[PDB]
Design a protein around this ligand. Structure first.
Ligand code: ZN
Lengths: 30, 21, 30, 21, 30, 21
């Protein structure tokens, strides 16, 4: 996988590819 | 969360898969 | 809607979602 | 224009809808 | 074409549009 | 490469077409 900082909608799209049929959760809070 | 690991720092394929279901 | 700064092609894609069947105009000039 | 409001500052759902037709 | 700095996946998507049926090569190394 | 021309600087339509096949 790419060696860059993944942010915004690119981070969500990374998660989409990497999980696939498993799906994911994006909870961006501190 | 993920915005401290994969955005403020860099994430490999595995540190990102921990955010799958 | 998201509380971030929307720029470039992400700003145009925000406008696409938010208007839909109304459409939009993107004129980026100062 | 929109690049001073929604990119240089932040835009809510309504301040962005003023750029629809 | 746009007068901005094209990076990341946006640079690859620029190359996709600009070449089309010719295709391209993306080799990001220094 | 392309990351020094089109990302660190700006590329017109032609300087980007040199990266096609
Ligand atoms: Zn982007």
């Amino acid at each position: 996988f790419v060696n860059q900082h993944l942010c915004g909608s690119h981070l969500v799209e990374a998660l989409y590819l990497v999980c696939g049929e498993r799906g994911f959760f994006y909870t961006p809070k501190t | 969360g993920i915005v401290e690991q994969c955005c403020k720092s860099i994430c490999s394929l595995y540190q990102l898969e921990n955010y799958c279901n």
